[PDB]
Design a protein around this ligand. Sequence first.
Ligand SMILES: COC(=O)NC1=C2/C(=C\CSSSC)[C@](O)(C#C/C=C\C#C[C@@H]2O[C@@H]2O[C@H](C)[C@@H](NO)[C@H](O)[C@H]2O)CC1=O
Ligand SMILES: Cc1cn([C@H]2C[C@H](O)[C@@H](COP(=O)(O)OP(=O)(O)O)O2)c(=O)[nH]c1=O
Length: 397
Amino acid sequence: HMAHLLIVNVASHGLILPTLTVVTELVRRGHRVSYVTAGGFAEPVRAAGATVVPYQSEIIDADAAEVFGSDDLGVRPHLMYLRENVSVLRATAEALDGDVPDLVLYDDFPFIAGQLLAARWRRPAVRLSAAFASNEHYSFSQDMVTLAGTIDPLDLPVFRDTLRDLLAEHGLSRSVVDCWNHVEQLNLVFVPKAFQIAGDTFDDRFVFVGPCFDDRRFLGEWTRPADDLPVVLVSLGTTFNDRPGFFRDCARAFDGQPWHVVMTLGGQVDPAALGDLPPNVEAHRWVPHVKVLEQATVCVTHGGMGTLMEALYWGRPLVVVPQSFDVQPMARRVDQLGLGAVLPGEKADGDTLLAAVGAVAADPALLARVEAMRGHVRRAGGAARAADAVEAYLARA
Ligand SMILES: COC(=O)NC1=C2/C(=C\CSSSC)[C@](O)(C#C/C=C\C#C[C@@H]2O[C@@H]2O[C@H](C)[C@@H](NO)[C@H](O)[C@H]2O)CC1=O
Ligand SMILES: Cc1cn([C@H]2C[C@H](O)[C@@H](COP(=O)(O)OP(=O)(O)O)O2)c(=O)[nH]c1=O
């Protein structure tokens, strides 16, 4: 049974955090795990039991708002995406050509490097999805392309040509379009099937294990106040979070109000830049959302899948304030399932947020649906089921 498992991934919070417990459970079962990452993420990855395979990352330093704002076609993001994939591919082949893994597990983002390594080494592969899974019916990629307003990457000759030669030099007998729309034989999705868009269309190639998490001390620590105010998490995530005005207006509206607000900035905005905060309002660069959500009454989030799932794991009603294309599908789905109030873009000013937080906290119908979804999240199976699926896949392969 014992195997050398490689996890191909890139330098991003949302993509890495869900995988940590899974790494640990596998190491516990006596498997060896190599994990591709960069920079500061190396530390938590090792602590989870994995051997780190460093690659030079471009996204880890990038500002997504700026990248997608650079040109009006998205040429810059498209080509950065390829480079990040290529950087990952080269580093991993270098490190592991001599220590070839039995299984290649790759996140959605580096799926090109994922397929290429699996083919180069003649190994089975597993795709990991930290957001919505994609199949022949629903494509999360297309959804994001359309919502982002960029050109279709395959309508970009230079992108298409690069990818083409990349497959060519690697002898992969697969066309660009088929490579791009490749559905792997096994998929681990960190979402409950009930939340997945078009969930019922997903067959046995997909295992919906939902979220799985530790205390995540590496994100700092947190304890609720010694008072009786209901706690409210407020976060714009880690990606499109350069929004001082938003956090300031939030603190202002909640000033003197019957809530305790915990705001997380995600490494972008400086807490000081907010000015003086009401006594019932905290501001941090980082605190574990799981620890706040355990004590929380309401979760205000832009719609990052991690935060949504950590929130629904505790059955907290939602106020989703999407400020960008990458979370529009998550927010749309929460709205569809009636799991919270959605305040898109400009709508999410402080006063509107104050009312929404109050509304969802006291909506009995909404609360029922949130408690039911919590159920689905709990049944998902998390890390243990992921590992079970992996080991069963190994047995077949
Ligand atoms: C998972 O599937 C993909 O990543 N798709 C793609 C994305 C692209 C470049 C990314 S890196 S540039 S640094 C900014 C792409 O250039 C183009 C495009 C249009 C929309 C998109 C998305 C994809 O990026 C996504 O960005 C989001 C902001 C991140 N969420 O917060 C996702 O983690 C990440 O995946 C082409 C592409 O294939
Ligand atoms: C900003 C922030 C994120 N997180 C976690 C929650 C998620 O699991 C993960 C990803 O952030 P998330 O809120 O999902 O935003 P994004 O769209 O940028 O991924 O990071 C914290 O634990 N504390 C924080 O302060």
